Write a protein that binds this ligand. Structure first.
Ligand SMILES: O=C(O)CNC(=O)C(=O)O
Ligand SMILES: [Mg+2]
Ligand code: NI
Ligand SMILES: [Zn+2]
Length: 331
């Protein structure tokens, strides 16, 4: 078995190897990359996502989210308070203000220590989940707006044509902005490109051990667990590496820098935080190996998780017994 310790693997494809996206994902899996839940891909030196970032300031963040924490430093939830619209140039100036900027630090490890010590005492503002793309249309390789769609994958594997579309999303971050512990909708893959700015630190649990994280979360968030049998789908719970280590949960960590891709694999729980002002692009995707994870994915029916139009068909075809109850939650 390849990668039996479930380490995060880092790949350096050549420009020739960067032509065929599906083939490269399958290659990484042949080497055991999926066992970690997360892999890093450093693009060939010849490749670029676009020519420059000089003209992005007029993108609108219609609904910036202030991430307010409750709990203790290592075990907390966050809720999202909606704020007034602002442009990316306005948000960048806010991120660089004395109130929101990255503090002085020695290295990524010192910064990580400061994040876990101090996160709960501040409420950073995240420009998350903005439909759009920063890849130039002429970028032919690993262009996250030109991937094969999940609906087409389901049709190719299973023969059933379904409605729905699959488009990318932009994320504008600042120091301490946080992504809570989750797997993707329908336990899909994700791919995330850090277009510019400061790093993003990731934590990940191997897919084979995901239920260990779920059991800990039920213990640590006991009211939330009674409320919903899949409350991590709400994307609100944070648990620190120190608390994971105290409770014996297998995990790994890595820091993504500008110019790098990350891939999350089906049922790979992940969480993390931004180091400072940045912009990332991400989208879900599927391969043949996902289908069995999609069939088994948990679902929130309490009504809180409220997701996309395209997830309807995935539930209806892959999970017909659950369909009814899950749709009651969605309506
Ligand atoms: O970058 C973020 O805030 C969150 N991204 C992801 O969870 C992802 O790409 O799957
Ligand atoms: Mg602009
Ligand atoms: Ni994710
Ligand atoms: Zn729920």
């Amino acid at each position: 078995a390849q990668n039996p310790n479930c380490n995060i693997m880092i790949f350096h494809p050549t420009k020739e190897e960067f032509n065929d996206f599906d083939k490269y994902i399958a290659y990484m899996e042949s080497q055991g990359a999926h066992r970690a839940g997360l892999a890093k891909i450093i693009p060939p030196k010849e490749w670029k996502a676009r020519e420059t970032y000089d003209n992005i300031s007029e993108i609108l963040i219609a609904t910036p989210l202030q991430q307010v924490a409750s709990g203790r430093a290592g075990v907390f939830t966050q809720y999202h308070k909606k704020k007034k619209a602002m442009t990316v140039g306005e948000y960048r100036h806010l991120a660089n203000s004395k109130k929101y900027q990255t503090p002085p630090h020695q290295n990524f490890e010192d910064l990580e220590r400061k994040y876990w010590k101090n996160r709960i005492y501040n409420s950073p503002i995240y420009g998350a989940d903005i439909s759009g793309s920063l890849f130039d249309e002429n970028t032919k390789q690993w262009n996250l707006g030109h991937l094969g769609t999940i609906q087409d994958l389901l049709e190719k594997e299973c023969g059933v044509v379904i409605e729905g579309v699959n488009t990318p999303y932009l994320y504008f971050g600042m120091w301490k902005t946080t992504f809570a512990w989750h797997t993707e909708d329908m336990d899909l893959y994700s791919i995330n490109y850090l277009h510019l700015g400061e790093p993003k630190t990731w934590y990940v649990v191997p897919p084979e051990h995901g239920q260990r994280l779920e059991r800990l979360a039920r213990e640590l968030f006991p009211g939330s667990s009674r409320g919903c049998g899949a409350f991590l789908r709400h994307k609100v719970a944070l648990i620190s590496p120190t608390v994971l280590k105290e409770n014996g949960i297998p995990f790994n960590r890595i820091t993504q820098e500008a110019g790098e891709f990350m891939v999350t694999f089906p049922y790979g729980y992940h969480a993390g935080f931004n180091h400072g002002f940045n912009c990332a692009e991400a989208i879900n995707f599927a391969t043949p190996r996902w289908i069995d994870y999609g069939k088994m994915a948990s679902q929130c029916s309490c009504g809180e998780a409220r997701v996309t139009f395209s997830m309807d068909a995935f539930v209806r075809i892959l999970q017909p017994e659950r369909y009814d109850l899950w749709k009651r939650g969605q309506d």
